[PDB]
C-alpha cells in the first residue's frame, strides 16, 4: 500500500503532466496521496493563473463575516457576524490596519504558536464564499472555472442526468481568519488555489481516521453533538494541534503559499488559518472513486448546515433513504 503513514505529499508536475487534470489526480492517488486527506501541487514554472492581480480591487465582498470565537484557546467555536459590504480594496486596507495586521514573527512556526495562543481574543473579518473566478479565460490548465462538473461525473458513472451547476468561490482572508474542521459537502474533493498574498496553514486528518476526529469532537462539543448527529457540517468547531496530539488523533499540517494548489480528498477533515491578507479560489470536484464516499456521507438534518441547490440531487440520487429527512432540514 502506497503512503501507509498517510503523509501529505507534494507534487511538481511538468507542463506536459499539467494538461490532463483527471489523469494527474489519478496519478497522485496511485502514489497514495489521498491517504493523507490533503496534497500540495506546485504548478510548472511556465504556468500562470492570470497575467497580473493589479485590477481586483473593485470586486465586492457583499457580506464580510466577523468570526467571533467562544471557548478556550485550543477548543473553541466561531460564529459569523455579518458586516456591511466592502470592496476588495477596502478589505485589503482593513487587513493591513494596526488592529488586524499580522504581528511580527520569526517564521511560520512562531506565527502558528501565536495563532493558537491568541486567536480567540480577536475577531478577524473573512470575505468567504464569493461566487466568481480569478483565472484568465485563456489559462487552459488547472483553470478552476473550466473543470468537468460533478453533475457530469455522476452522469458518466451512474447514467442519471441531474440538475445543478458547479462553480468556483473566492475567499479573501486576513490574519487569524479561520476555517473550521470539516469535510466537503457530500464528502467531495476540493481544490484550492492561493492566488496572491500571505500563506494559509492547513491541518488534516487522514480519511481512514476521520471517525476518530468525530468522536473527539462529540466529547469536546457535547451540547452541539446532542443537537445534531453531524454537527461538524456546521463548520464552526476548532480543535488545536496540541489538543489533537493530547487525544491521540492522527493528523498532519502544511503551509500553502501563493501560487500553489491544495487538493482535499473525500472524507479528509481539514481546518486552518490565514497568515495575512490573501485571496484563494476553490471548488468541489468528483472522480469515480468519490461515488462510494458520496453514498456514505453524513448529513446535517437539524437545519443549521443549509447548503447549495446542487446538493439536492446528490442526496436524492445517492442517498434516497435520507432524502426526506435531509430536505426537511433544508426547508
Ligand atoms: O480557504 C478556506 O477558507 C477554506 N477552503 C477549504 O475548506 C477548501 O478549499 O476545501
Ligand atoms: Mg476590480
Ligand atoms: Ni474545505
Ligand atoms: Zn446540524
Which contacts qualify for 25-30: CB closer than 8 Å, 24 or more apart? 25/189, 25/263, 25/287, 26/287, 28/263, 29/289, 30/2
Ligand 1 close to Cβ of residue 192 (< 6 A): yes
Resolution in A: 1.4
Q: Can you tell me the distance from the alpha carbon of 182 to that of 97, in angstroms, rounded to the nearest whole number?
A: 30
81 assigned ligand-binding residue: no
Could you tell me the three cell numbers for 179?
Answer: 476555517
Ligand approaching nearest to the C-alpha of 227: 4
Residues 6+ apart with CB under 8 A from 92: 57, 172, 277
Residues 6+ apart with CB under 8 A from 121: none
How far does Cα 326 stand from its chain's mean position? 22
Residues 6+ apart with CB under 8 A from 324: none
Q: How far is the CA of 83 from the centre of ligand 3 (A)?
A: 23
3-state secondary structure of 196: strand
Reading phi first (left if > 0) and then psi (alpha if -120 to 50, else beta), residue 32 is in left
Could you tell me the three cell numbers for 23?
Answer: 489523469
Residues with CB under 5 A from ligand 2 (ion): 56, 58-59
182 assigned ligand-binding residue: yes
Dmax over Cα atoms in the chain, in whole Å?
55
6 assigned ligand-binding residue: no
Q: Can you tell me the distance from the alpha carbon of 215 to that of 151, in angstroms, rounded to the nearest whole number?
A: 32
Could you tell me the three cell numbers for 300?
Answer: 446535517
Ligand 1 close to Cβ of residue 6 (< 6 A): no
Ligand approaching nearest to the C-alpha of 279: 1
Residues with CB under 5 A from ligand 4 (ion): 228, 300, 302, 304
Which ligand 1 atom is the nearest neighbour of the CA of 128? 3
CATH of domain 1-331: 2.60.120.650
Ligand 1 close to Cβ of residue 274 (< 6 A): no
DSSP code string of 237-301: EEE-HHHHHHTT---EEEEE-TT-EEEEPTT-EEEEEESSSEEEEEEEE--TTHHHHHHH-----
Domain boundaries, the chain: 1-331
Q: How far is the CA of 304 from the centre of ligand 4 (A)?
A: 5
Q: Can you tell me the distance from the alpha carbon of 151 to that of 149, in angstroms, rounded to the nearest whole number?
A: 5
Alpha helices for 68-221 (secondary structure H): 88-95, 108-118, 150-158, 210-220
| Secondary structure letter of residue 39 according to DSSP | E
Reading phi first (left if > 0) and then psi (alpha if -120 to 50, else beta), residue 197 is in left
Cα-Cα end-to-end distance for the chain:
44
Q: Can you tell me the distance from the alpha carbon of 297 to that of 185, in angstroms, rounded to the nearest whole number?
A: 8
**Strand (E) or helix (H) holding 28:** helix 21-30
Ligand 1 close to Cβ of residue 280 (< 6 A): yes
**What number of CA atoms fall less than 13 Å from residue 260's CA on the CB side?**
21
For the CA atoms of 310, 311, 316, 321, the dihedral, rounded to the nearest 10 degrees, stands at: -170
Could you tell me the three cell numbers for 239?
Answer: 480543535
Residues with CB under 5 A from ligand 3 (ion): 190
Give the residue, by CA position, lying nearest to ligand 1 atom 7. Answer: 179
Amino acid at each position: 500500500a502506497q503512503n501507509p503513514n498517510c503523509n501529505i505529499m507534494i507534487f511538481h508536475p511538468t507542463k506536459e503532466e499539467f494538461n490532463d487534470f483527471d489523469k494527474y489526480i489519478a496519478y497522485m492517488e496511485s502514489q497514495g496521496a489521498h491517504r493523507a486527506g490533503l496534497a500540495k501541487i506546485i504548478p510548472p514554472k511556465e504556468w500562470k493563473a492570470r497575467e497580473t492581480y493589479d485590477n481586483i480591487s473593485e470586486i465586492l465582498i457583499a457580506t464580510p463575516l466577523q468570526q467571533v470565537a467562544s471557548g478556550r484557546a485550543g477548543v473553541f467555536t466561531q460564529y459569523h457576524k455579518k458586516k456591511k459590504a466592502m470592496t476588495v480594496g477596502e478589505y485589503r486596507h482593513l487587513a493591513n490596519s494596526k488592529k488586524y495586521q499580522t504581528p511580527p514573527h520569526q517564521n511560520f512556526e512562531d506565527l502558528e504558536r501565536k495563532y493558537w495562543k491568541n486567536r480567540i481574543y480577536n475577531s478577524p473579518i473573512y470575505g468567504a464564499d464569493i461566487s466568481g473566478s480569478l483565472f484568465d479565460e485563456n489559462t487552459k490548465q488547472w483553470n478552476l472555472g473550466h473543470l468537468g462538473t460533478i453533475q457530469d461525473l455522476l452522469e458518466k458513472e451512474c447514467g442519471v442526468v441531474i440538475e445543478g451547476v458547479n462553480t468556483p468561490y473566492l475567499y479573501f482572508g486576513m490574519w487569524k481568519t479561520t476555517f473550521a474542521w470539516h469535510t466537503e459537502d457530500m464528502d467531495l474533493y476540493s481544490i484550492n488555489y492561493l492566488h496572491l498574498g500571505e500563506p494559509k496553514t492547513w491541518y488534516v486528518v487522514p480519511p481512514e481516521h476521520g471517525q476518530r476526529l468525530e468522536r473527539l469532537a462529540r466529547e469536546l462539543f457535547p451540547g452541539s453533538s446532542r443537537g445534531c448527529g453531524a454537527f461538524l457540517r456546521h463548520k464552526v468547531a476548532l480543535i488545536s494541534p496540541t489538543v489533537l496530539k493530547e487525544n491521540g488523533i492522527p493528523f498532519n499540517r502544511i503551509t500553502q503559499e501563493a501560487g500553489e494548489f491544495m487538493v482535499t480528498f473525500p472524507y479528509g477533515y481539514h481546518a486552518g488559518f490565514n497568515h495575512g491578507f490573501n485571496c484563494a479560489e476553490a471548488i468541489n470536484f468528483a472522480t469515480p472513486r468519490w461515488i462510494d464516499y458520496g453514498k456514505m456521507a453524513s448529513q446535517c438534518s437539524c437545519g443549521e448546515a443549509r447548503v447549495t441547490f446542487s446538493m439536492d440531487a446528490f442526496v436524492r440520487i445517492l442517498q434516497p433513504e435520507r432524502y426526506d429527512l435531509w430536505k426537511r432540514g433544508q426547508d
